[model samples]
Target: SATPHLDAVEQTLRQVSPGLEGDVWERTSGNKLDGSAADPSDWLLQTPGCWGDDKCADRVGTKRLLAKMTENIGNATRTVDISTLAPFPNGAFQDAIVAGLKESAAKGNKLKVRILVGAAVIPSKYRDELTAKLGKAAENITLNVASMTTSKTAFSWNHSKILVVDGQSALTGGINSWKDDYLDTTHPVSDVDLALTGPAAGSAGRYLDTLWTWTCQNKSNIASVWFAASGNAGCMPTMHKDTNPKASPATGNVPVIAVGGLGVGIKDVDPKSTFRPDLPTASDTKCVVGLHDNTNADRDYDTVNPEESALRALVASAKGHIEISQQDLNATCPPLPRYDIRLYDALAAKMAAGVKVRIVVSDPANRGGYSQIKSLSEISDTLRNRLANITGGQQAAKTAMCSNLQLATFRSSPNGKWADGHPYAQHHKLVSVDSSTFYIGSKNLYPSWLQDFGYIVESPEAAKQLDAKLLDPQWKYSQETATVDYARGICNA
Candidate 1:
C-alpha cells in the first residue's frame, strides 16, 4: 500500500530508527472500533482552533466526540454510561448529553443511561436543570456520585472524563462538555480526546460500572434534595453484560495503559500501586502515567505522586531528545516565583548528557491562560545559570550535556480571533521522549486541582506523528507569535 503524504515525514523517520518501525507502532495498538488491521480504530486528531488559514476547520473538537456519542447512543440497544466532571449549567453541551439519552429511550428499547459525576461538584442548579429537561425520561437515566473520602460531605473531585456507549465504544481525554470546549468559531478551549471501539473500550465500560457500584454505596441523596423522588431512594444503575451487539471484534491489538484516580473513591486500594501494572517496561519503548491524587497524604511511599514519578523517570531515560506540550512548565500555578526545580534539574542533567530538550506551553497572554511570559523568562534565566555553573573539576567530568534547551510559548495567530475577542490557549498535556514514548491526558506537568487520568503509548509511530502534527506545529507557530526567552543561538558561534 502506498503511504499517504501526511505520513511521509514519519515514513522517513522509520527508515532512520528501528524503534520507529511500523511493527513497533503496531505493538502499541489496542482494540479499535472498525477492527481493521490497516487502520485500527479510527483515531481522530483535533486542534480545535486553527493554526493558520489552512488549519481553520474544527477538525477534532469536543463536538465531534459528542456527535459520535449521540450516534452511538442512537445505535445502542442495551445501555449508555458516562463518567465526567461537572457540566456547565443550562448549556448546549449539557443539552446534547440529555438529548442523546432521550434519543436512546425514544427507541423504546429499554435503553438505560448511567451518568456519574465526581463528588458534589455538579451544582444543584445544573442538576435541577438536567432533571427538569429529562422529566419522565429521567427515570431511565440514573445520575449518581462517587468519593473516597471520609467527610460526610465529600469534597472529592473526579477529573476523569469518559463516555461509554453500549459497552463497546469509549471516549476519554482532557475535554469536558463546556461551551468553550466545543464551539470552534467561538471561545474554543483547545483539547485532545480519543474514541475507542474494541476490548480497550470494554475495559473502560467496566470501569464505569465499577464507579457506578461505588457511587451506589457512597451515594449522593440527589433524589430527596433536588429531584423530589422521596427520601433515601437509591438509584442503582442496573448491571448488564459487557458485550455490545453494535461493535466489531478486535482485528489489531494496540498496547494500551489505562491510568485513573482509583484510590480516591475506593477503599483498600493502594495509592502507590494503581498505575504500576500499566507502566510499560523500559525495553518496550518505556512509558509512564501522569495523573493526580486527591490527597498528598500517602505521597510518601516510593513516589506515590504518579505524575512526578513518571516525569522524573522519563527525563532520566531520554537519550536523544525530550519534547513536550502542556498548559505550563512552571512548578505550580502562577504568582509563585520558583519553578518545578526537580523537573528542571532532570532536564539539565539530560542536557548535560547530550539530550536535546524542547518545550511548547500556551502563551500567558491568551485568555484564561496560566504561567506568564514572566514565569517563562524566570525559567530561562535559571536553566542558563545552572548549566553555566557546572564548571568545577568534578562537574566538568560529569557534564557532557548539549546546550540545546529551547522553550517557546504557543501564541494564536494575530489574524485568528475567537468568536469572542479573547485569545486562544494551548491545552494539550503531552510528552514524547526519544521518539519511542508518549503521554496524553488531563494533568498538566505542574500541580493543579482535581484528580486526572492519562494514557501512555510506547509506539514510535504515534510519537513521530505527534511530533510532526502536534508538537512541531506548535513549535513552528510559536516562533511566529511567541516570545523566545532563551536559546543557545548557535551557528558555529
Candidate 2:
C-alpha cells in the first residue's frame, strides 16, 4: 500500500494481463520470479511494462526513437507526453521535438504536447525561450519543469527520458534531449532507447501523468506548472479521476514491469512509498544510494521499492550468466555509499556461485565517457575486493571471482565519433540474465539518480535482441584486463 498511484500500477498490470499478478505482487504473496512464475499472463498483470510477442518493443538509438515519438503528431490528432532529465534549449534539438506541435498550430489541427524536464538542467535563458515558444504555439504545446535536487544535501534529479504519444507509442531509456550529448555527431553519447507501442504507450503515459502530479504535490521540487490549456496556473494542476485511454490503457499482450523509483526523502512520503518503506516521516532525509531499513544497513531486507524490487527479482533468479552494461559503474550512492550495493552483492554472490558475469562500462579516458565517483578500474577493484570476505575469507573467495567475473570498458566502432576519428565510449544501461529476461530503460547499474523507468521484460527473443544490440557489440569492441589480473591485485597496489 504505497501511493495510490503505485497500487494503480499493479491494478493496470493485472488488467493488462490477469495472469502475472504474482511476479510483482505484495511481498506476502507467492508471486515468483521469471524462472518459476506461473501463468505468464498473471505475471503480466503483476508487471507494469508492455508485453507481447516479437512486436512488444523495439530497443534502438536515442535520436531515432525520439524522432519516432514525435512522428504522426501533427499529421493527425494526437496528444503527446514527454519528460526527461535534460533537454537542450537550443534550436536544432528543441525545434525537432516541437516541430509537430508547431505544425499543429500552423495547420490548426488537434495536437497537444506536454513537456517536462529537470529544471536545474535548463538555465532561464533557454527555459524561458522554450516556454515562450510553447506559449506562442497557443493551446497546442506546454512546458513544465521540476528540480528534485535538495541543494547540497542530496542528489535527486528527474532523470527519466520518457516519451508517450497519443497513448499509442512509447520511448524511454538512457540518453537525454541534450543536443550535443545525444543528437550531435561530432561528440555524442552513444545511447539506446526502447521504442514501444500499443498498451505500453498508455502505460508510459500514465506513469508521466502520475509523475507530473507527484511533482506538483511535492512543493519543494515542483518548479513550474504551466499548461497550454491554461497558462502557468501558478498552482499545481488539479488531476482528475478520469482515465485517458489514448493516454493510458492496457491493450497489449506483452508483459513489462514498468519499474520506477523517486528518491525524494520527505516527510510527506506515502507510508509505504516504494523507495523508502516505513520511514515515511522524518526517519530518512538522505535519499537514494538504496537498500536502507530500520536495521541491517548492509542487507536488503525490507526493500519493496519497485525499481530495486524489479532488479532484485532479475538478479536473484540468475542461474547461469548475467550481463551488465552502463556508462558509470559505481555501486555506491550518497549518505551510505558502499552499503547501497544490495544488487551488487547479489552479483558477487552469483559470481561466487559460478554464474558467469560480465560488466562492460564506459571508460572516462575515452571520448564522451565522463568520470563519476570512481574510475571503472577502481570499480573493478571494488567489485573484486568483495571476494575477500566471502566464503569464510579463504582463497576460495578470491578463486570464485577469478573464475567467474570479467570486467571491461567499451569502445563502440564508428559510434558518435570524437572528431579526432576515434569512436566515443558506450553510454548504455541494461541487464540480461541467462539470456531469458531483459531490462532496458534508465537504470544505470549505479542507481545514481531517481525514477528508473527501467522496463523489465520476460521475452527471450527480446533479451537476445538487446544482447545483440548492446552486449554483442560490447564484447566485439571490448578492452579489459582479464579477471586473473584483478585477482593478482593489479589495482590493489
Candidate 3:
C-alpha cells in the first residue's frame, strides 16, 4: 500500500471508526447503526483527557499469548486443538474455545490438547523484569512447563489477551487467567476478548505470524523482514518450535484476514494535509499510535464505531440478558458517548426497556494506574459526573442521579477480602448479552479508549457461559482485594 493511499484509507476509516485512533478521538453514535454521517462538521474529535504510557505491560504481555491462539483457532482446517498459555480476562477467554473444541473433540474431533499459561511457561519473573507485573492465580488451572521463551526480542504482549486455535476459533479478552471473579458491577473489573472465526480471524493469524516470524523465524529486524512478517503472528500453518509433541490436525472452514497496525500517517492522505496536526482532529484531540488514523479529513475522533462493529453485533443480538464484567463503570467518557450512547448508557437504557443488564467491574486497585493517564482518567471523571447527574431521576439534584445508575467501584482489601471501598486499578473486561452474543477485548470505557486503538471478540456460546458463571451467586461471595474509594466516583447522570 502506498503512503498516500494508506493515508487516504485511514482517513476514510476515521470517519466511521471511533477510538480506532488512540486516546484523542471517539465516536458519537450510540451503537453506530447507520453508516451515515450525524454531523457535517461536528467532525468528531476530543483531546486525550489524561496522560500515561501503557502501564499494564504485564497485562499486554499476557494478551499476546491469547491473541495467537484466537487467530489460530479460527483458521483450523485440518484440526485445531491444544494447550495455550495466556493472561486474562485475556487468559480466561479460552473457556469458550475449550468448550467449542471439546464439542468437536468429543464427537471424535481432531483438536490436539495442550494449554500452559501463567507463571509456569512464561514465568512471572520474566514479566517483572520488564516492569510488566502479571496478576496472581496459577493453582486454579492445569499446568505444564511448556518451554522457555525462545525469542530474544519481546513486544508489549501486555496486550490484555490473544487467541489462536486451529484456525477455527480463538480469542483474547477481559477474563483473567485466574478464576472468574464473577463479581457484579458493584465490584466491576471485567471485559471481553474476541475470537475471530470468519474471514477476520485471518487478520489475527497474520498479526501473530508477524510477531512469531520476528521472534523465532527471522534473525533480521530490517523493515522489509519485519513488515513482511508483521501480521502473520497467528497463521504459522505449522507448529510453534516449543510445542512439546505436535499440534492437532485442522478441521473447520473459517477464512482468515489479518487485522492490525497500518504503517503510515496523515501527510500521506493529501500533500496538503499536515504531517502531524497540533489537535490531530477537529476536537483538538490526541491519538495514541494504534487507534488513531493520521490520514483522514473526517475528524470523528475518540470514536470506536469501526473497531466495535463486532461488539455491536453481539449487543444487537442479545436475547435474555446482558452481562458485563468490566474494570470501570463511568460510561460517559471518550469512546463512551457524552449522552446516553455509551455501552453503560446503552445497558441502562436497555434495562429501562426491560432487558436485564448485569455488569461487574474490577476494583480500581487491581487495575493499578489508568492504562493511559493522559486520557483514561480524564474521561472517567467526566463520565462519573455525567452519570451522577442523571441515574437517580436527579438531573435536578446531583447526587441522586448517580445513585440509580448503580455505579460502584470494587477492589481487594488488605484483609484479603472484597469490599466497596473506592476505585482501584484492575484489568478485567467482558460483556455477554443473552445466550447469543458476547464481546471480549482490550479497550476500556474511557473517552479516549473507545476512540483509541483496541480489539474485541464476539461469540455466542461464550455469552451463555458468562451469563451462568459470572452473573450468578458467585458474584456476591467474591472477595475484594483492595481498599475502595469513590472520590472519583461522583457521576452527573
Candidate 4:
C-alpha cells in the first residue's frame, strides 16, 4: 500500500491521557490541559543563525546540547525514548544521548532506550561502546529502535521531534539533527527545543509508546532486530490506555496540550472558493499545492488531524496578539494560493476582532537560493488581500487590519541587521498568543503530507521566555511591513 494505516488520533490520545474520561479539558489543573507538561522544562535554542563567514551568535552551541543530553541520560533510570525526522544513522548525538546509560544500568538499574527516526534505522553504534564507556557490565540495558520508512509509506514522514528521559522529563520543539542543520556553528541552522519535566514528560513517553506500536506493526522485523534484552516486550503492540490521573498543579504548574497530526488522505482549496466557508476571492490568491487546479480540492480536512485543529484552535482563541514564525505561509507560485488560505482566513477574522497578527516568514532569496532579494516574492500583495476580503465588518475589519496586521521576513544576519539574503534559513515553527499561551512544535501552517507534532502550552512564563530567547530576537531584525504596505487601498473600502 502507498500510505500505511496509522493509529487513530483519539485513541492514541486516550492512551496517553486516560483520566480525561473523554473530556478534553479535564486535565486543566492549573488551567492546563491534562496529559501535557507544566512549566517543567526550559526552552533550548540553536541559533547558530549564521551566513557566509559571519557568525551571528554561538549561543545555541552543540557544546551546551551535548552537556544537556549527558545530564538527561545520566538522570534516566527506567527508560529513554528519542524521536526525530532527520536521518542520523550514528554520531556524536547518539553518543551524547546515551552518555551514562551503562553506569546507570550497572547500578542494578534496569534501563531501556527507544530511538525512532522518520526513515530506516540500524541499532545504535553505542551498543559495543557500553562496555567501553564505564569499563563495566551493562547486560541489563536494552535498546528498542524503530523507523517509519520501513512501513513503505512514500508520502508521510513523522516530522515530530520528541526526546523523553526516565518518563519523568521530555523535550520537544523545532531542533532537527540534519547534517549541520543545527550542528555546525559556523553556518548552523536556527531552531528551538523545550524541556517538559513533570507529568508532561510521562505523557510524552506514552506518545512515543503508541507511536512505537504503529512502527512495530508495520515493520515488525525492524523492531525484532534491536529488542536486545527486553525480548520483544517493547516490540509487541499493547492497548495501553493513558494511565495519567489528571492535570495536577505542582511546584511550577503550567498548562499544556500535545497535538499530533498525519496530513494524509486530504485535499486543499481556497478558503473562500470552497463549500466550507465562502468569502471574497482574490485574483492572485489560489491553491498552490496538493490537488487544486484552482477548481478541485488538493488536501481538504477530510482526514482528522489534531495539528491543524491545534493551529486553528490557538489562533481562534487569541485575544491580544499572535506572533507566527515559519518557513513561508507556503505561497510559492504567483497568484496560486494554497492551503494556507484556511489559516489566513482564521487570522484575518481574528484581526477584525482586534487581535494583532505578526508573521515572520523565511526570506525567499535564501529559501530558494535566489541571486537577488528584490525579485523574490515576499507574498506582500498575496498577504494583504486576505485581510482585504474582510468586507462584512467593513469599518472595523479595515481598521484592525491596516493598523494591526504585520508581515516580516527572516534575514541572513538575524540579530545583527535586517540585511540581505544569505544561504541560511530561519527554520522554526512557533506561535505565541496574547503572551498568555503559545504553540511550539515541528509544524508549519501549510499543505503537507508529513506527520507533524506540536504542543499548545498555556503559560506566560514559558511564552515570555520563548519570546525573549527565540521569537522576539528574530522579529527584532526581520523586515516588518504592516502600517505601510498593508495599509494601501484600504481607505477606499
Candidate 5:
C-alpha cells in the first residue's frame, strides 16, 4: 500500500540514483530530503567520502546529509528525534539542527524535538554553547544526555546513532557528528550510514522512543547526579506516548527490525533479539536489528555475552562466505570472552567447515600510530595457528588449513597519505554473510565495552548489494592494492 507521497519519493530516488554520487543530486523534481518529501517509502544509501581519492565517487559525506536533515527540520510539521553517542559539533551543522527546531516551533506547529546525546561525550561548555545558541527556542527542544547504568557503576555509554524526522524516515549507522567524520575534499574521514524508510523507519522510531523513556524515567543515582548537576534537568523534554505510527507500505521492500538493549552492567543484557519482542517478523523485507550491551567492567564473565551470541549465530549460520569491514583489528577493548578468542574460534570453525572468511580492517599505524602495527599480525597468527590446532590430525589439518582466510587492511594512499595529511581508515562496521545476510552498525569487530546498535538484514538483495559494494573495485581498494607482508607484520605493502 504505497501512499502517493511515498510513491513520489521512491520515484525521485530511482531517477536520481543514476547521477547521485556523494552529495551531488539533480533537483529535477525539486524534491529534497526534508519534510516536503514526507514518504515512508524513501530509502537511500549515503556515504560521506573516500578522502581525496576518486576511487570513492559514490560517497556524499555528512555535509549533504546535514543539509537534508536541516531541510527536513525546517519543513517538519510534528516531531524530530535524534540520538547519538557524540555531541553535535559546533558548526553550521549544529546551527542547522538547532535553527530547524526553532523555525518549526515558531511556526506554531506544536513540533516536538527530542535530542539525546551521550552524557560522557558532551562537555559542560558544549551544553552551554548550544543552550545560548538556541535561546528562546531552547524551551521547545528537549535536550537530554543519556547515561547507562550498572549495579556497581552508575554510568555507561550509549553509542547508537539514529535520527528520525516527522515519523516518516530514519537514519542510522556509524557516522558521528564531528569534523573528522565528514568529507572535506582533503581529509574527509571515510564513513558509511543508512537512510531507512517504510517499516524500518517505524521500528527505528520505536527504538528511539524506548531510549527517551528510559532516560526520562531513570531514577538511578548517576542520573540524578548528572541531571541535577547539569542544571537542565527541568528542561527535559516532555515525555510523549508511543504513537506506534504505521509506516506506509514500501515497494520491493527489504524487511528491517530494530535490535538493541540498554546495558545494565554485569547482568548480561540478552542480545539475541531486539529490545521490543512483540514486533512481528517481516515477511518480505526482514530487518533484524542487533545491538551489543557489554558494559560490565568485569573481564571474567560466566555466561556468553549477548553480542558474542549474536555474532556466533551469524557466523555459524553462514553456509558460504563471510565478508567483514571493521575499524579495528586487535581485540583491545574489553568485550565478551575478555578477548577475541571466541570470535576467532567461530571464524576458524566456519573456515574449517569450508566457509570463506575475508576481513578488512584499518591499518593500526593509521588508526592508533605505530603501536598498532603488530596487533593485526598477532591476531592473524593466532587465528591461523588456532585453526591448525583445531583441525589437527594430519588429515584434518590438511582439510581445515587456513586456505579460505583472506585478510587486508584499509591503508593510506600511495605516498602514505590520502589527503590533507590524514591517513584513510576503513572506519566501517559491516559484516555480510553468504551474500544474503548482513549486519551494519557502529560496533567494531572488536567493539567497545559500551552501548552500540547494529541491524541484521536477512534480505538476499540487500546482502548482494552490500557484498557488491564491499568488493567493488573503487571502494574495495584495500583488497586489491594491499598485499600482506608477513615478514614485518604489514597488511599493506
Candidate 6:
C-alpha cells in the first residue's frame, strides 16, 4: 500500500504535455553525499532528498516550477496547498515564497511576497523555520496571520488549499506535500483540485492580497493573543505597524471584495465590518485578495453557514466542469441532500451534460480519526462504483466522470515512506468550475465547513495554465508512473 507519486506525475504530464523541455538554473548546494544525480531535473533521480545535494536538487524542482510561473500568468500558477500528513515543520507557504524570492532575486524581478497565516497558529516550530529561511529573503515577504478556527478571531479559519502565482495563475483543491498517501493513479483519494488561469487567476491573486492584509497595518484590534495574566490585554498590531513603517494608503483603487459568513442567509459576525469596502474607490488597477472567515473565534464550532450554502448553489449552477478537494467530506453545514447526496448527484448531472467531473481525496485508511477514516473509505468506494457504472467503460466519459478523481493518504513526517502522522491536517474547502471561473475560500462542500469558514473567486484562465504547468504536476506525481502505488493504499484496512 505504498501510495505512489504517479498521480502527481501524470498531472505534470497534462500541464507540461507534448514533452517540451523547460529551462531552469539551479544550485545543488554542497549537501550531496551520495552519487546522486547531478541534475535536479533528472527523471531517474530516486534518492529521497533528505540532506545536502538531494535537498538542494529537490528545492530546484520547486524553483523549476516557479520559473515557468515567472514567465506567465493564468491557470498555469493557481495552486491548492495542503498539509494532511504532517503539520508544517517550518515556514508553511513561505517555503514556496522563499523559492520565489530566490528566483526573483536571481532574475532581478522587483516582487513582493505576502503570507496569510492562520491566527489560531501560535509561534511554534514553523515560525522559527520561516524566519530562518525567509529572513534573508525578508525584504520581499509580508506576513498576515489569521485564525483558521471559529473560536479565534472573526478573521476566519480560512483554508482554501490554494495558491495563486503572479496574479496570472492559481491552483485549488486538496493535496499535501509530505507523505505519499494522497495518490490516485487509478482511483480517487476522496480529494480533487483544479488549476486556473486568465482574468480568473488575477481575481484569485487579488483575493490573496486582501486576505494577507488581515494582520497588516490597516487592520484594527486584530490580536495575536487573548487577555494576559498581567493584564496586557491590548490588541496585536501588524508587522509594519510594529516596525514603524507607515502603512501605505492604497493609492490606486481596485475591486476589492471580502466575503465571509455575513448577510441574511449567512451567519457570520463582522463579516461586513472586518474590512472596509470603501477602500476600493474604483481608481485601482489590480483586483486582489478577499480575506474572509468561517466565524470569529467567538464560538466553539462553526456559526456561519450561508457561505457553504452559497458554495452548493454555485456548484449546482455550473455548466462546463467542477473540481473539488478537501480533507473532510461529511460537511455539516448547508446540509447534504437526501441520502446525504448533495454533490454526488450534482456531479452526476454535470457528467450527464458532458461536463467533466474529477475528484481527489485522502485515503481514509491512512488518516487519523476513525469515523473520518471509515466514512471516507466507504464514500470513495461508493463514488468509484457509481462513476464506473455511469461511464460504462467509455474512456472519454470515464476520464471525465471518474478517471481523474485520485485518492491517497499523506504521511506528514519527512520520512513517511510508509504511513505516519504529523500534527498539521489538510484544511481546504474549494471548488473550481471550469478554468475560466473558480472559487477559493474557507467554505467546504459540507455542512460543517459551510458553517465554519469559506469564500469564492471567479478566477482567470491564463493563470490556470500557469498553475497547471507548475503545481499541477505535484498532483500528477501519483497518476503517471511505473513504481507508483495507487490502488492498494485506499483498499488497505
Best by lDDT: 4
Taking the tens digit of each residue's C-alpha lDDT, what string does model 5 give over 139-242? 66545444433233424556677777766666667777665445434545555666654555545556566555555566355542233213445434333334
**Cα deviation in Å at residue 144, candidate 1?**
3.6
Tens digit per residue, CA lDDT, model 1, 1-493: 1212213223322232223122111122345433124433235334463555333454443445556656666666676776666544226656667777687767765555555555443444555566778777666654533332322222335566777777666666666666645553455656666665655565555555555555555455443112212124454534434335324356344455444434332433333232322222111011123323222223322122244444555566676888877767653322221344445666777766677777777666663444444445555555554554444433442233324656666654544434356566677777778776665666566544344555555556666656665666566556554334224342111
TM-score, candidate number 4: 0.73
In candidate 5, residue 159 scores what lDDT? 67
Q: Which ten residues in a row have the lowest lDDT in candidate 1?
A: 279-288
Which residue segments of model 3 deviate by more than 4 Å?
A: 1-160, 163-171, 174-203, 207-305, 309-321, 329-356, 366-406, 410-426, 447-462, 478-493
TM-score ranking, high to low: 4, 2, 5, 1, 6, 3
lDDT of 4 by residue, 311-388 (tens): 765777676888887766663443334445556677877776767777776655564421112321334444456666
Model 2: per-residue Cα lDDT at residue 270: 31
Report, for all candidates in order, the number of backbone clashes. Answer: 11, 18, 193, 19, 11, 129
In candidate 1, how many Å is residue 128 off? 5.2
**Model 2 segments more than 4 A misplaced:** 1-63, 72-78, 87-91, 103-112, 119-152, 218-243, 246-252, 266-304, 331-339, 366-369, 373-377, 414-423, 447-449, 479-493
**Is candidate 2 or 4 superior in lDDT?**
4
Query: For each candidate, what is the lDDT?
Result: 0.51, 0.51, 0.32, 0.53, 0.51, 0.34
Please provide TM-scores, in order, for all candidate models, with all chains considered together.
Answer: 0.68, 0.71, 0.42, 0.73, 0.70, 0.43
- Indicate the worst ten consecutive residues by lDDT in candidate 5: 21-30
Lowest lDDT sum, 10 consecutive residues, model 3, at: 42-51
Candidate 2: residue 475 lDDT (0-100): 66
**Alpha-carbon RMSD, candidate 5:** 11.0
lDDT of 4: 0.53
Please estimate how well model 6 matches the true structure, expressed as its whole-model Cα lDDT.
0.34
